[PDB]
């Protein structure tokens, strides 16, 4: 059983590249992080920053989560991210994604001891 913290890392961290360099990034990544196994995950963001930088967000600007809980945090600074969203034609198991590279603030929900990201709420 994956911890919530480990699931976050698998779904959202990509420290290995500074940015998506092709329009096929999302197709490539969604597959390999096993986010298309059972169904096409519809929306998923990858963050191209160190794990330390992403964990540090839990110490930054406290905001409400979409769900009304108040354990979310917005990064003071922008981060390099890639936004992956399934195209309207996509059908499992031939999952297809639009890739959008950007520099935006991230908002994550944090939980636990240590107090670490367990959900990606949005980018700004
Ligand atoms: Cl979950």
Numbering used by the authors: 1 to 124
The authors write:
Toward this goal, the present work describes the use of bovine pancreatic ribonuclease (RNase A) crystals with a pore size of 4 nm (P3221 space group) for fixing [Rh2(OAc)4] and developing a heterogeneous catalyst to perform reactions in an aqueous medium. The structure of the [Rh2(OAc)4]/RNase A adduct was investigated by X-ray crystallography: the metal complex structure remains unperturbed upon protein binding. Structural analysis demonstrates that 1 h of soaking is sufficient to metalate the protein and that the crystal packing does not influence the binding of the metal compound to RNase A: two binding sites were identified for the metal compound, close to the His105 and His119 side chains, in agreement with that observed using RNase A crystals in a different crystal form. Overall, our findings demonstrate that the dirhodium paddlewheel complexes can be fixed in porous biomolecule crystals, like those of RNase A, to prepare biohybrid materials for catalytic applications.
